[PDB]
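Morning!

As promised:
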Amino acid sequence: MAGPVDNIKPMKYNDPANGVESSIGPQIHTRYWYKRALIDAAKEAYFGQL
Amino acid sequence: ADTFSMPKHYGKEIVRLHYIPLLDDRNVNDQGIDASGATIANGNLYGSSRDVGNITAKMPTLTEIGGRVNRVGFKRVEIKGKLEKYGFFREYTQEQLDFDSDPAMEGHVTTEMVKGANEITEDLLQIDLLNSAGTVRYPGAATSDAEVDASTEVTYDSLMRLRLDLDNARAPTKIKMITGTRMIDTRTVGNARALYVGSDLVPTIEAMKDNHGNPAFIPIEKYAAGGATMHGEVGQLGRFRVIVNPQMMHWAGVGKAVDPNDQVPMHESGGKYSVFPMLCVASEAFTTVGFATDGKNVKFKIITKRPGEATADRSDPYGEMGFMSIKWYYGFMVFRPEWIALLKTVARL
Amino acid sequence: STEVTYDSLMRLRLDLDNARAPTKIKMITGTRMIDTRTVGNARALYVGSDLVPTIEAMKDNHGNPAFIPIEKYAAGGATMHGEVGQLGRFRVIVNPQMMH
Amino acid sequence: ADTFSMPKHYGKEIVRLHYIPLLDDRNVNDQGIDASGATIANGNLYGSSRDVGNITAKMPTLTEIGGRVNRVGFKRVEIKGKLEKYGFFREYTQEQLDFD
């Protein structure tokens, strides 16, 4: 479920996207953006040609 | 598999946008002025419906005066992907090398460790592919892992239904049909797609009959004269090309209790049946994610420290031990989960 | 009890012939390749994707499969867009947008 | 069949070594440390197992702090050969060759 005992507890990067925020403080960006959208293909016609 | 290089200062997540078409059931909206003019909670114009009676009642009709009628709208969706880290180490002492009878032990050990590390990534990729796939089919009134019995075996109808389900999602085929040749004792083969199966299902595949009481398996030797062959190919079962992967996994121990009153061996483990997968995965659907790879080639990071006075410290003022460790990153993120198909069956008919 | 049968398709073909409907697909007299088949005159016939399983499991009046896949007679060559085979004297075309 | 020439002053036996891989069931040792820094009495890392359930629980994994986790080890084995001697003879007399 996790690693071994810490016994140190330094300035970490605990998961900010859900739950515990951070050591330094608030974050600006927590995810990278894929700039190319996913578009479905067009359908096909069988009766129009005839 | 393709690889995507995640940037350094954007966290541990990737997000992508998806655009829904107009005539779709996922396009729930509120711009709903109808033919006569009225706000209704339907702004997609009968989207994704194939009933004639329903369709010829929401068709957008117009009069000679026009007016505010037949408004529509659009929507958006998003998808996500993640990351993770892995690693392992090994330590030894100095006297193990000086007093061993084999002077070449170190090289063999290092090569074995590197080679073993080179397979964990493949195992991770296979596990990720298996655990993230839609359109899971159980042949015959099973619908779950807890209802798998000796009668839940792969048949021709199940394969045909799986192919139909794959085609309904507009998955792309990549293997063309062969019409035959002049070569005596050959057979014709239609267009198909790759299908990876383990080596434990070979006896079952060799003993399967089609809907008309004939052997459905066409060996590679029959049609290889006029066609092409890829690595690991053993033949075409239905409209799929079977590829035997020696490292394919399975679910051992899941299923119903074994019934001794059956005429078939039915591979078992721990008093219960076993489930074997048949996977049809198409490229350009999923992708892999790496990190801290400036040149994309250094996936592994290795740190080694030999015994001596460079590892003195205060817990061992003599320095009698050394170690070596490997660490790396890995992530998976999938588009179109309906383009990966899985069929769960039993073995050894 | 109202399902596709070879007798129904034969009756439909006879009814169409009684109306002097035209046929635009010729017959394949044969090829020199091993494991091929010969088919007669036929006309196009559009079906939805949900009727494939029942079509694939049809038997004629002699206990033999009736659906001949496209791979068997493709040496001659008609190969229309969505054609997948010849069931009786009809060329079956699967239309992904068929209504019901 | 191949042939190997045994040296003189070494006896009548040949011994050879064999090295076992890491992800194997024959690599049985006591250098295993779990992903939570605990001994597990096995260090072959789920070797020679093709169960989806067994894997994904013995995978290495790592956190920010690291620590002493995921230890491994290796082994080796031996094989042997042997040798023997054979022979036979024949006897005769002089008069058998002259008055024949």
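Chain A touches chain D at residues 2-6, 8, 10, 12-13 (CB under 8 Å).

Hope this helps with the figure draft.
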